[PDB]
Structure formats: C-alpha cells, structure tokens
Design a binder for this molecule. Structure first.
Ligand SMILES: *[C@@H]1O[C@H](CO)[C@@H](O[C@@H]2O[C@H](CO)[C@@H](O[C@@H]3O[C@H](CO[C@H]4O[C@H](CO[C@H]5O[C@H](CO)[C@@H](O)[C@H](O)[C@@H]5O)[C@@H](O)[C@H](O[C@H]5O[C@H](CO)[C@@H](O)[C@H](O)[C@@H]5O)[C@@H]4O)[C@@H](O)[C@H](O[C@H]4O[C@H](CO)[C@@H](O)[C@H](O)[C@@H]4O[C@H]4O[C@H](CO)[C@@H](O)[C@H](O)[C@@H]4O)[C@@H]3O)[C@H](O)[C@H]2NC(C)=O)[C@H](O)[C@H]1NC(C)=O
Lengths: 47, 48, 151, 79, 37, 76
C-alpha cells in the first residue's frame, strides 16, 4: 500500500531521483514480506 | 588419468568458463589497433 | 549462493541432489578400499623381503577391520539409496560382490607369498599363479570402473 | 639538516624487478580465483564447506591485489 | 608500450587457440555418457 | 602565464608538468597572410618566430609534448 501511496507524493513534490531512492527501500521490504507470506500460503494450499 | 578422475560435470563447466573468458579478452583487445598506432583521439565526424 | 528465495520446493531435485552427494561419498570410500588393497600389496612385498609373518598379519587384520567398516558404511548408504528408489543401489551391492572376489584374490596372493617364502611354492610356479590372480583382479577392477562410471 | 650532510633515498624495489613481480603475483592470484569459482558452481548445498571457501578466497585476494600494484607501477601510473 | 606488430601476433595466436578449444569441447560433449542419459 | 606542477612519489619518481601560454608581442600583422609567399621567399615574415628550443633536465624521461586538442608531432 505504501508504494502505491508514494506515487501521489511524487506527483506533488518529489522529482525522479528522489522517488527512486525511496522506492528502492520500500520495494525491498515489501518483497521480503511477500516472499515469506507466499511460502506460508503455498504450504496451506498444498495441505 | 588426472583429468579422467574429475567428474564430467567439472570438466564441462571448466571448459565453458575458459572458452568464454578468452573470447571476452580477444573482443576487447582486437579493437586497440588504432589507439596504439595513432594517438588516443576521437575518430570520425559524428562522434565529436 | 547461500540465500534461496524459493516458494515451492521440488522433491525430485532435492532427492536427486542428495543421491549425488551420497554417490561421491561412495566413490571416495571404494577408492579407499582399492587403496587398502594397495597397502596390503605393499605389505606382501615387505613380508617377502623380511620373511616376518607378523608384519603381514597386522596388515591383514587392518585390512579386514578398516575394509569391513567401509563395507558396512557402503551398505548403510546403499540402504538410503534404495530408500530413495535409486536404481544404483543394486549396482553398489554388485560392486561389493566383485570386491569380495578381489578381496579373496588378494588373500590368495598373500598365502602364495607365504608359501614362496617358506619354500612350499616354487618361484617359477609363483610367477604364473601371481599373474593369474593379478590379471583376474585387474579385470574385476575394470568391471568396477565401468559400473562406477554408470553411477 | 642539508642535502649534502644527509643521505639519499630510492624505492627498495628496483625498477628492473617490477616486470617479474607483476607476472608472478598475477598468475598465482588467477589460479586460486579460477579454483574458487569452479568449486562454488560445482558444489551443492550438502557438498560445500565455509572453511574451505574462505581460505581459497583470502589467498587469492592477497596474491592478486599486490600483483595489481606492481602492474600499475610497471605501466607508469605511480600512486 | 607494445608495438602494433606485437599486438597483431597476439591477436592471431589467441584466436587460433580458442577455436581449437571449442572443437575440443565438442569432442567431450558427444563423448559424455551422461549427456545421453 | 605558466603553471608548473611538481609531483613527487615515494616510488622513485617525480613527474613535472608545465602549462605554457605564449603570445607574440611584436608589431601586429597587417593584411592577409600569404602561405605561398611565406614558403617561397626566405625574407617573408622575417620577424615571425618559427621555433624555439628548451633546455630540459638531464635526467628527464618520457618527455611528451601535447596541446588541449591532442598530441603535437612536430617537436624534435
Ligand atoms: C606525439 O608528439 C610527439 C612530440 O612531437 C612525437 O614524438 C616526437 O616525434 C618526432 C618525430 O620526428 C621525434 O623527432 C626526432 O627528433 C630527434 C631530434 O632532432 C633534432 O636533433 C637531431 C640530432 O642531430 C644531431 O646531429 C646532427 C648531425 O648528425 C646535427 O646536424 C644536429 O645539430 C645534431 O647535433 C637533428 O638531426 C635534427 O635535425 C633535423 O631537424 C631539423 C629541424 O628540426 C632540421 O634542421 C635538420 O636538417 C634535420 O632534419 C633535430 O635538430 C631526431 O634525431 C630524430 O630523427 C630520427 O627520427 C626521425 C623520425 O622521427 C627520422 O626521420 C630521422 O632520420 C632519425 O631517424 C632515427 O631513427 C632511425 C630508425 O628509425 C635511424 O635510422 C636514425 O639514425 C635515427 O636514429 C627525430 O626527428 C621526436 O623525438 C619525438 N619527441 C618525443 C618527445 O618523443 C610522437 O611521436 C607523437 N605521437 C604520435 C604522432 O602518435
């Protein structure tokens, strides 16, 4: 949700370079959470 | 028999790395003929 | 290399990787078994030069003590290989069957050397009898090598 | 403390030495580096040991890193 | 600095060796039993 | 103007680079410059300066002569 929210903030204030710098950190945390969550869901589905 | 005792998977990977590594070296090196023979300058009209 | 961001595992790949890890371990052990025969052969040469039976006896007991441990370990790993359904499990037992033939042939060489030192066996006869035992032993090793490649 | 009263200095490593050192050091570094990569790719989860990997990597880095410095001096880009 | 004559000989040598090695790779690859397994 | 840069390195070498800006302060040339006349006649442009010689250190090595736009091959 935060990554989608960041788009609006870019619209009003940030530039291209700033938006990417924040986006990289936010994407990394989201990816790690997604990978752990998906593995748990996969085990439940396959049970 | 030293080469034979190595597993085939080792042999294929080792040859693969050696062939590709050399090819990269040749690709870069062959393009230096102009820089050695002449001064290190920009060539042609468009590149400027 | 250590990190893997996987979601769904593949059992077939994991087991296949496991068997390979066992397979190399089996290969090392059998190579040691061949090495043990090499030391025993050297012991036979030492026995002939010195004519001291005690040196050979200690070497023999070491061979059947270390080798038996290797065979038991090979069977134990083979049990795991059979558990995985690997087709090789029969082959490793087959190699052990050949290995027993090599082991007895090595024993036959040892007794022949003992007779030669004692004078029960003539040197002229000994050369041919040793040649036959070594030649069949080499052929058994040749069979083992091909099946080892088959692994 | 004047030039005539005092001594003179030169690099301990003489210029003629530099070509030999660069070749020898780089070759040793290359051999270990190739060994490290081949071992890593061939090795698997159950076949890899951290201790062996660290020893090879450290040795390779040391030999090549010094070799590079001699190469820079031999080329003439003095630090 | 290396002269152009040295560079030309160097280029020829590496290329010839590399191609031969690729031929050798073909030899082992077919010769490989596990490739047919 | 001239800028003299001296760099001393502990590896047995000191490198010196001098940037030189040169202007001819003689009487200003008037009218067109004839290349054909200049080559053909010795007297043409007698005031003009063709070359000058610099006395460098005896130990100087790897001497290089260049300009902003590249090397100059005319120096002997
Ligand atoms: C990037 O730019 C740099 C800088 O420009 C380039 O490097 C430079 O390249 C030039 C190319 O010419 C090199 O020039 C060399 O200069 C020396 C010095 O020349 C002066 O001294 C000479 C010494 O003569 C003494 O003795 C005679 C009697 O024998 C007396 O008369 C003299 O007074 C001296 O005591 C002298 O001969 C020269 O005179 C010549 O020039 C003047 C005008 O300058 C004329 O009036 C004279 O009549 C005469 O023409 C001069 O005063 C020369 O010695 C070199 O000559 C050799 O090399 C020439 C080719 O470069 C060649 O034509 C000559 O025959 C001679 O050949 C040499 O090598 C041959 C083998 O190849 C031998 O057979 C031969 O015996 C001899 O050894 C030369 O002209 C610069 O040195 C060089 N500069 C630096 C800093 O390196 C660089 O290449 C560029 N890079 C590019 C373009 O990629």
């Amino acid at each position: 949700a935060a990554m989608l929210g960041l788009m609006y903030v870019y619209w009003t204030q940030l530039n291209m370079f700033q938006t990417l710098k924040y986006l990289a950190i936010l994407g990394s945390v989201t990816f790690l959470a997604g990978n752990r969550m998906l593995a748990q869901q996969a085990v439940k589905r396959t049970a | 028999f030293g080469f034979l005792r190595l597993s085939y998977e080792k042999q294929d990977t080792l040859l693969k790395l050696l062939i590709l590594s050399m090819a990269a070296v040749l690709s870069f090196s062959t393009r230096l003929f102009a820089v050695l023979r002449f001064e290190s300058v920009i060539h042609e009209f468009d590149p400027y | 290399v250590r990190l893997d961001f996987s979601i769904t595992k593949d059992p077939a790949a994991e087991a296949r990787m496991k068997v390979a890890c066992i397979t190399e371990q089996v290969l090392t052990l059998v190579n040691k078994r061949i090495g043990l025969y090499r030391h025993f052969d050297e012991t036979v040469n030492r026995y002939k030069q010195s004519r001291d039976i005690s040196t050979l006896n200690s070497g023999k007991k070491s061979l059947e003590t270390e080798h038996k441990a290797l065979t038991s370990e090979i069977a134990l790993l083979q049990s795991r290989l059979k558990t995985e359904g690997s087709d090789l499990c029969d082959r490793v037992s087959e190699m052990q069957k050949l290995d027993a033939q090599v082991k007895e042939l090595v024993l036959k060489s040892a007794v022949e050397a003992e007779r030669l030192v004692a004078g029960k066996l003539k040197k002229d006869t000994y050369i041919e009898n040793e040649k036959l035992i070594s030649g069949k032993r080499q052929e058994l090793v040749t069979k083992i090598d091909h099946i080892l490649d088959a692994l | 403390m004047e030039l005539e009263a005092m001594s003179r200095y030169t690099s301990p490593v003489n210029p003629a030495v530099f070509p030999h050192l660069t070749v020898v050091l780089l070759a040793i570094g290359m051999f270990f580096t190739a060994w490290f990569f081949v071992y890593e790719v061939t090795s698997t989860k159950y076949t890899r040991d951290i201790y062996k990997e660290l020893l090879i990597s450290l040795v390779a880095s040391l030999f090549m890193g010094f070799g590079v410095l001699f190469l820079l001096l031999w080329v003439g880009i003095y630090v | 600095m290396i002269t152009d004559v040295q560079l030309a000989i160097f280029a020829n040598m590496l290329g010839v060796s590399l191609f031969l090695l690729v031929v050798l790779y073909h030899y082992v690859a077919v010769n490989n039993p596990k490739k047919q397994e | 103007s001239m800028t003299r840069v001296i760099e001393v390195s502990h590896w047995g070498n000191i490198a010196v680079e001098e940037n030189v800006d040169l202007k001819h302060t003689g009487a200003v040339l008037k009218g067109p410059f004839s290349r054909y006349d200049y080559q053909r006649q010795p007297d043409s442009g007698i005031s003009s300066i063709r070359s000058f010689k610099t006395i460098l250190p005896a130990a100087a090595q790897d001497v290089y002569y260049r300009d902003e736009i590249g090397n100059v091959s005319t120096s002997h």
